[PDB]
From a paper:
Natural resistance-associated macrophage proteins (Nramps) are APC-superfamily transition metal transporters that enable uptake of rare micronutrients such as Mn2+ in plants and bacteria and Fe2+ in animals. Nramps bind and/or transport biologically-essential divalent metals such as Mn2+, Fe2+, Co2+, Ni2+, Cu2+, Zn2+—and toxic metals like Cd2+, Pb2+, and Hg2+—but not the abundant alkaline earth metals Mg2+ and Ca2+. Metal uptake by Nramps is typically stimulated by acidic pH and accompanied by proton influx. Nramps have 11 or 12 TMs, the first ten forming a LeuT fold, as seen in structures of three bacterial Nramp homologs, including our model system [name] (Dra)Nramp.
Adding steric bulk along TM1a—for example a [name] mutation, which mimics a human anemia-causing mutation of a conserved glycine —prevented the opening of the extracellular vestibule and eliminated metal transport, emphasizing the importance of the alternating-access mechanism to DraNramp function. WT-like DraNramp (with the indicated reporter cysteine and a C382S mutation to remove the lone endogenous cysteine) maintains a dynamic conformational equilibrium—even in the absence of added metal substrate—such that either reporter can be fully modified by the thiol-specific N-ethylmaleimide (NEM) at high concentrations. [name] slightly increased A53C accessibility but fully protected A61C, indicating an outward-closed state that we will refer to as inward-locked based on these data and the structure described below. We have thus identified two complementary constructs that trap DraNramp in outward-locked (G223W) and inward-locked ([name]) states. Using lipidic cubic phase (LCP) to mimic the hydrophobic membrane environment, we crystallized and determined the structures of [name] and G223W to resolutions of 3.0 and 2.4 Å, respectively, both significantly improved from our earlier DraNramp structure (3.94 Å). Unexpectedly, the [name] structure is not in an inward-open conformation with our Fab-bound Patch mutant but instead adopts an inward-occluded, metal-free state that may represent an intermediate conformation between inward-open and outward-open states in the DraNramp transport cycle. The major exception is TM1a, which swings ~45° to partially seal the inward aqueous cavity in the [name] structure, a motion we previously showed to be essential to the transport cycle. The intracellular ends of TM4 and TM5 also move slightly compared to their position in the inward-open state, further sealing the metal-binding site from the cytosol. Comparisons of the [name] and G223W structures indicate that, rather than preventing inward motion of TM1a as we had hypothesized, the [name] mutation precludes TM4-TM5 from fully closing the inner gate, as any bulkier replacement for that absolutely-conserved glycine in our outward-open G223W structure would clash with E176 on TM5.
Author numbering: 45 to 167, 174 to 436
The structure:
């Protein structure tokens, strides 16, 4: 189902880095960020899936077929940058997990991950790979209960509070890792077909089934993300630990549960998430290219081009977790440019048919878009001026 692929993409190294760094640096105070981002992601993924089901065309294809040529050029370029950032995050996460597993430097780890992507790109194994991530998520769900978190701080973390200079930055990172624009584009394509009869009855059936699937998947994965942040908080926040929040250290979150094999299991799960999410990211990037332009560059060429930012970042000596969080921030910045056409098209009868979005949900989505735009503007204000 498309919800499985969306949940695979929602469990990427970017999500891992954001959850762990948020926990370690700010305690439970971003649980409300995670919850709100998960709700917005539910709404937006539902809107994109409904767009796909009702119109038969995905969001990039509709943009290309309905909007002026220069606007389509701009949209293709921005979506390509979004895909570059997403694949950078996921590929560098896979490389960092290879490093944690074997001991190789980041360069040769990225080389091994490139060989693995070459081996995979020949082609059902990504859901099996994702099962590792699902199991480490269950491990986190148990570790939350076992770690005995401070329920007072946990409850206080659900009240919306941006406290500190980098709090807005990390909340933007969480929102970008949860509401992924490449997945906003890809979800419409995942439900484009499989419709034997174009009737409104079957379209409504698909809409409801996909709604249930995506809500279940996003709810489970948001429970997992909140659990990861809570364990990271209870593990590194109050205690003064060096390099707290780095994914190299994050294995200590599951030490009281797994024991000596905690680091190996965390490295394996992060590699699994990196590979699966990178496959999903290359799929979404090819869908973006096709929908926006009409033609396609070779898949191996796109893979080799998307490896270039990863290898450049490795050569620059930049920190992997830091650049992952930055990539998720860039994704959050890219979110509104994808939300606007989605809302406009889902509020149109000539596009949706009898499945036009309810005006209440359209207003909710516009409120979400305004919130995200204001948060991105506030982050830009803090990062550039006073
Ligand atoms: C200061 C302004 C903030 C004021 C507060 C505004 C909050 C609105 C934002 C997020 C909640 C929206 C998500 C809650 C609804 C979730 C419904 C859902 O998940 O399903 C959607 C449905 O399937 C569609 O087709
Ligand atoms: C046992 C496996 C089932 C897992 C069930 C899902 C766990 C909760 C999920 C999300 C909330 C995470 C936010 C933290 C909420 C408070 C943490 C908590 O529940 O603590 C338990 C209690 O303190 C102990 O005595
Ligand atoms: C952040 C600030 C704006 C993000 C909103 C992005 C707005 C994207 C351009 C506006 C638009 O989508 O207008 C298309 C119109 O339908 C063509 O006929
Ligand atoms: C607090 C700021 C207001 C936020 C949301 C209000 C609803 C936002 C409305 C967005 C305007 C763009 C639009 O959707 O225009 C449709 C128009 O009704 C076609 O006739």
């Amino acid at each position: 189902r498309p919800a499985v692929i969306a949940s695979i993409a929602y469990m990427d190294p970017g999500n891992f880095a954001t959850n762990i760094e948020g926990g370690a640096r700010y305690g439970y105070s971003l649980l409300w960020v995670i919850l709100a981002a998960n709700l917005m992601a539910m709404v937006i993924q539902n809107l994109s899936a409904n767009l796909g089901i009702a119109s038969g065309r995905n969001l990039p294809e509709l943009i290309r077929e309905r909007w002026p040529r220069p606007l389509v050029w701009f949209y293709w370029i921005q979506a390509e940058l979004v895909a570059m950032a997403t694949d950078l995050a996921e590929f560098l996460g896979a490389a960092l997990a290879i490093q944690l597993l074997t001991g190789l430097p980041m360069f040769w780890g990225a080389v091994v991950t490139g060989v693995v992507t070459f081996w995979l790109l020949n082609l059902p194994l990504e859901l099996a790979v994702g099962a590792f991530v699902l199991m480490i998520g269950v491990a986190y769900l148990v570790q939350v209960v076992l770690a005995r978190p401070d329920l007072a701080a946990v409850g206080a973390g659900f009240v919306p509070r941006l406290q500190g200079p980098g709090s807005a930055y990390l909340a933007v990172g969480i929102i970008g890792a949860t509401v992924m624009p490449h997945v906003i584009y890809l979800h419409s394509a995942l439900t484009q077909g499989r419709i034997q009869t174009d009737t409104t009855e079957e379209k409504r059936r698909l809409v409801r089934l996909n709604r249930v699937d995506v809500i279940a998947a996003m709810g489970l994965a948001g429970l997992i993300n909140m659990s990861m942040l809570a364990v990271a908080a209870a593990t590194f926040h109050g205690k003064n630990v060096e390099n707290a929040g780095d994914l190299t250290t994050a294995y200590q979150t599951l030490t009281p549960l797994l024991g000596p094999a905690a680091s190996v299991l965390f490295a394996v799960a992060l590699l699994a998430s990196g590979l699966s999410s990178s496959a999903v990211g290359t799929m979404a990037g090819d869908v973006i290219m096709q929908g926006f332009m009409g033609f396609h560059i070779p898949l191996w060429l796109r893979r080799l081009i998307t490896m270039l930012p990863a290898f450049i970042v490795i050569l620059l000596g930049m920190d992997p977790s830091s650049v992952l969080i930055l990539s998720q921030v860039i994704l959050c910045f890219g979110v509104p440019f994808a939300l606007v056409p989605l809302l406009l098209f889902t509020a149109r009868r000539d596009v949706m048919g009898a499945l036009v979005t309810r005006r209440s949900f359209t207003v909710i989505g516009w409120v979400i878009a305004v919130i995200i735009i204001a948060l991105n503007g506030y982050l830009l204000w803090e990062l550039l001026g006073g």
